[PDB]
């Protein structure tokens, strides 16, 4: 019973399930927040490197001056979502002045991923995504995850893509639910080491993008990310 | 063989045969072209004592001059009648002159036609008898699921068509000059009784209508009342 727009005996829509199986096939992303920041980490499939470093793409994408998102799964797809989101980001601001609420955004995105699971003659987006940012005139960090089916959810820190299960575990016994990572510096320190499981040496496979309130934003440079690998392998050897 | 549009290895549309097969299975209907005008009759089947008599009419008029009846799938019949009803009334509004029976059939034949062309639709499950008058006389035809119809001197379908057929055969020769308007009815009344002898354990109610410039006056009227009774009794004597 797999060609879904129909139900399994036990009430499943196996297609929608399988689609998730592709998000795992894809690369990996992870987000974390503090009481002032929200960092987004990602890896880099540095595989057939005989291509200009310069203009070729990188996971994290700004949707509005104060909000960004990342994914894992089909690049081919992902792009189209980002675009449609960016558009709605303005259509709002236009017809309402007030710039978008991160919760709202996601709900829109999830509404689209959700639209591609109803009419026969369309197929679901093989993309699950992490969306982070700070609401207009607000200082409370927000993190949400959306996935293929159409569900949106807020997390304190979450990860998607291949080997998410692992790092997830790691995170689970590191991120203190009671108090979030205070300083930005260390909030990063965290995420970085959490990716060092799958990375397999080299800040040459680790992308970091950091977001603060009041529409500030800022991707990271290679050495910056390296000075962390450094100051971490150091305390690992010190244990 | 399972879809409506398709053809068989040697050119055959099976869905239409089954259509036909269902037409036979239902009640029996007839009609007769006489002196001037026509006469129809059908077989309402009283399945219980809880059926109000003189009630569920299977015969229907079109415009104010066309008798009409059928058998097979009852809702299919009803449906088809509606289209015929528009076509008529539209034409009428357009040309003013009440619609020529000759063409009418086609309008319907053409509509029954279509439902043999596409797979997404279901073939018409009824054979239909009808007629009326005009300037150049009265006519009578009989449309099948295939959409093919023609003009007959009298027609019949549903369960026992042969009974009435060989029955209609006789009339031809002894009255090769068209049977009397009056006698037409009472004769029809009989031809039904004879053909009913299959649903014999189950009683029934006979319905009759007719057209004639002399009797109906150009119109189509329901044979009910006094003429209706004697026409039965008339049948009731020969019923031995």
């Amino acid at each position: 019973d797999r060609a879904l727009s129909i139900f399994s005996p036990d009430g499943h829509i196996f297609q929608v399930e399988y689609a998730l199986e592709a998000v795992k096939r894809g690369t990996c992303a992870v987000g974390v927040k503090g009481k002032n920041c929200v960092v987004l980490g990602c890896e880099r499939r540095s595989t057939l490197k005989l291509q200009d470093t310069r203009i070729t793409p990188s996971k994290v994408s700004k949707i509005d001056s104060h909000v960004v998102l990342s994914f894992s799964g089909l690049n081919a797809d992902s792009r189209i979502l980002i675009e449609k989101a960016r558009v709605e980001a303005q259509s709002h601001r236009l017809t309402l002045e007030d710039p978008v609420t991160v919760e709202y955004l996601t709900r829109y995105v999830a509404g689209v991923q959700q639209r591609y699971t109803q009419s026969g003659g369309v197929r679901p987006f093989g993309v699950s995504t992490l969306i982070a940012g700070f609401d207009p005139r607000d200082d409370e960090p927000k993190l949400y995850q959306t996935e293929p089916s159409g569900i949106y959810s807020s997390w304190s820190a979450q990860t998607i893509g291949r080997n998410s299960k692992t790092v997830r575990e790691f995170l689970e016994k590191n991120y203190d639910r009671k108090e979030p990572p205070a300083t930005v510096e260390e909030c990063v320190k965290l995420t970085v080491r959490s990716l060092l499981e799958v990375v397999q040496t080299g800040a040459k496979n680790i992308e970091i993008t950091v977001v603060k309130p009041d529409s500030d934003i800022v991707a990271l440079s290679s050495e910056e990310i390296n000075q962390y690998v450094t100051q971490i392998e150091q305390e690992k050897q010190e244990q | 063989d399972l879809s409506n549009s398709v053809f068989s290895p040697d050119g055959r549309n099976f869905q239409v045969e089954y259509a036909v097969k269902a037409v036979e299975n239902g009640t029996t209907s007839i009609g007769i072209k006489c002196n001037d005008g026509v006469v129809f009759a059908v077989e309402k089947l009283i399945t219980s004592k809880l059926l109000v008599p003189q009630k569920n009419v299977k015969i229907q008029v079109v415009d104010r001059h066309i008798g009409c009846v059928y058998s097979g799938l009852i809702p299919d019949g009803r449906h088809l009648v509606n289209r015929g009803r528009e076509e008529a009334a539209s034409f009428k509004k357009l040309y003013k002159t009440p619609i020529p029976i000759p063409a009418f059939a086609d309008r319907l034949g053409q509509y029954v036609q279509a439902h043999t062309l596409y797979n997404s639709v279901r073939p018409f499950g009824v054979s239909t008898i009808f007629g009326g008058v005009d300037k150049n006389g009265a006519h009578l035809y009989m449309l099948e699921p295939s959409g093919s119809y023609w003009g007959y001197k009298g027609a019949a379908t549903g369960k026992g068509r042969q009974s009435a057929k060989a029955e209609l055969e006789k009339l031809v020769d002894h009255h090769p000059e068209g049977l009397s308007a009056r006698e037409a009815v009472k004769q029809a009344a009989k031809i039904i009784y004879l053909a009913h002898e299959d649903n014999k354990e189950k009683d029934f109610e006979l319905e009759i209508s007719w057209c004639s410039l002399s009797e109906t006056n150009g119109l189509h009227k329901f044979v009910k009342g006094d003429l209706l009774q004697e026409a039965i009794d008339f049948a009731q004597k020969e019923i031995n």
């Binding site: 675009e83 960016r86 558009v87 303005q90 601001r93 | -």
Partner: protein, 198 residues
């Protein structure tokens, strides 16, 4: 009509725009900015029909900002003004035209030079050293034809403009309630807020 001025100088552009708002008889707000920054280095003053005005501006604004984060690269004053003109060109033959005139000031970073485009509601564009929509030109254009020099400093321009204003006051029937002035340059936009105490 209202007041919309603009003047291109050395390594910047300057936009003047009256502050008052009128409803037939009374004057509602009189501290109203008829401006709308499109991107960090592009800016647009406008005057036109009551509703048509503020809607269109924001709408244009929207598109740009969109393009600018999508691409991550900023759009050139030249091309910007081209698109605005595009939109009005259609607008004019639409079931209902947005009746609005505009001035667009920007600093083209590639050429490292300031450009200024005047555009009426009919979809009529032109790069200019300075301009003014409506009746605003009649009263001033002369003084500009007179004293204007391409080499003038940012300050030089203000003085000039300041003089144009003093005139508009002196011979214009309407009370425009003063002006808000703004500068676009290699540094971006800032407001000469001082033009009240100046």
């Amino acid at each position: 009509m209202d007041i919309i001025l603009g003047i291109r100088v050395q390594d910047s552009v300057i936009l003047a725009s009256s502050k008052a708002v009128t409803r037939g008889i009374s004057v509602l707000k009189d501290s109203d900015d008829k401006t709308r920054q499109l991107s960090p280095h592009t800016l647009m003053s406008f005057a036109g029909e009551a509703g048509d005005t503020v809607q269109f501006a924001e709408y244009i604004q929207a598109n740009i900002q969109l393009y600018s984060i999508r691409e991550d690269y900023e759009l050139s004053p030249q091309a910007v003004s081209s698109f605005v003109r595009q939109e009005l060109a259609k607008s004019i033959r639409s079931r209902r035209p947005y009746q609005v005139n505009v001035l667009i000031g920007g600093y083209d970073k590639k050429k490292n030079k300031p450009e200024l485009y005047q555009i009426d509601y009919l979809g009529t564009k032109v790069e200019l050293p300075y301009g003014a929509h409506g009746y605003s030109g009649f009263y001033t254009f002369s003084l500009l034809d007179h004293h204007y020099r391409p080499d003038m400093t940012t300050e030089e321009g203000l003085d000039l403009l300041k003089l144009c204003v003093q005139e508009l006051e002196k011979r214009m029937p309407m009370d425009f309630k003063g002006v808000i002035v703004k500068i676009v340059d290699k540094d971006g936009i800032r407001q000469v807020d001082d033009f009240q105490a100046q």
